[PDB]
């Protein structure tokens, strides 16, 4: 992501970073001569795009088993007695196969304990959430503040600058704010300086013609 | 492919088989702990599926490539001065390069020299044949007859029985005609004995319903 930022010292940059960190990239998910043998493999079976195309086209299909089982599990379930706790138990096993499916085909399995997916369905059918606004926490990613504060690790981040980090920002600065699982690369531009011209167009000549 | 064939001694029978070799087989062409690493072998990247895929499409888009110069290619002349020899080697020229990457990618190279597609284009602009009837001969194999007497080598054929060839054939006579690129293995089953058994039925008798 790009950012424009003003003037900081870098540990207030890296604080405003892990700010807009949270809520803006997807969560991270760990579960996701010479020039001659480079000629040699270039030119072998493209193992790596038909394995992307298998791997896209079963995402799309077990996407499709969970909008159908999340739908059929919606109209189980009316207004009106029963709580949204224990309709959003009994609705939960008309779509917990399809969803464990497709879980497991994202490689979004530690994210989703049952329990939270059980929160989350109480949660639509309490503010009357369609099975799509169900579902738009599950298709894609999503951040990482949408999810547990166990996965947060919002302590542990690390500020690695070559530059002593009281200093402000300047064209060049990289700095890393590292965890234990990656790292977040961030460099610094400056943001040019501009010369506006100022141009008068008459709205009366604005004329044309039908050839070309 | 199958035959029927009567009261035969096995070399009457492998002359009466190379007879019908070459108009019905295709045309030989010579360019085209252990059950556990099979397990492994067969769960890996289906690699043969895709090039085959590629293959056929490739085929297919050549193909196309082919009959679009082909058919361009005959509208460029007209009954009536200019020889059929003469006007197939003039419109030889907007299609001698489809035709070359369709052989290419066919492997039908060596079978087609240019002086037999030229001799095949005027024999079909002199007995009035579309486009399509000149393709016939490239688009597909076809048999070894079709093509020029240096492939043929009928001198070549080898009898090879375990049983004495004068003695006519019995069930599980298998025997082989080889040749110095291939061989063809024969096997013979007896024709199986019928007992037909006569049934009249009714044309009266065929009665309906709308049920099921």
Redesign the interface.
């Known amino acids: 992501r790009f950012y424009n930022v003003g003037h900081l010292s870098i540990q207030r940059v890296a604080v405003w970073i892990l700010e807009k960190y949270y809520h803006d990239f997807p969560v991270y998910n760990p579960a996701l001569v010479i020039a001659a043998a480079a000629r040699r493999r270039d030119n072998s079976?493209n193992?790596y795009y038909?394995?992307e195309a298998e791997h896209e086209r079963r995402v799309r299909k077990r996407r499709a088993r969970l909008v159908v089982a999340v739908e059929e599990a919606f109209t189980h379930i009316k207004r009106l007695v029963m709580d949204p706790r224990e309709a959003a138990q009994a609705i939960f096993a008309s779509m917990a196969r399809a969803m464990q499916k497709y879980l497991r085909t994202t490689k979004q399995q530690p994210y989703h304990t049952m329990e939270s997916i059980l929160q989350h369905l109480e949660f639509c059918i309490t503010h009357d959430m369609t099975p799509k606004a169900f579902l738009e926490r599950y298709l894609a990613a999503g951040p990482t503040i949408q999810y547990h504060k166990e996965r947060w690790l919002a302590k542990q981040w690390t500020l690695v600058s070559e530059e002593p980090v009281t200093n402000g920002l300047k064209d060049g600065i990289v700095f890393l704010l590292k965890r234990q699982d990656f790292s977040l690369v961030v460099s610094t531009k400056k943001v040019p300086f501009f010369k506006l011209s100022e141009e008068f167009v008459d709205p009366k000549s604005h004329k044309f013609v039908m050839r070309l």
Chains 1, 2 share one sequence.
């Open positions: 079976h193992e038909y394995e």
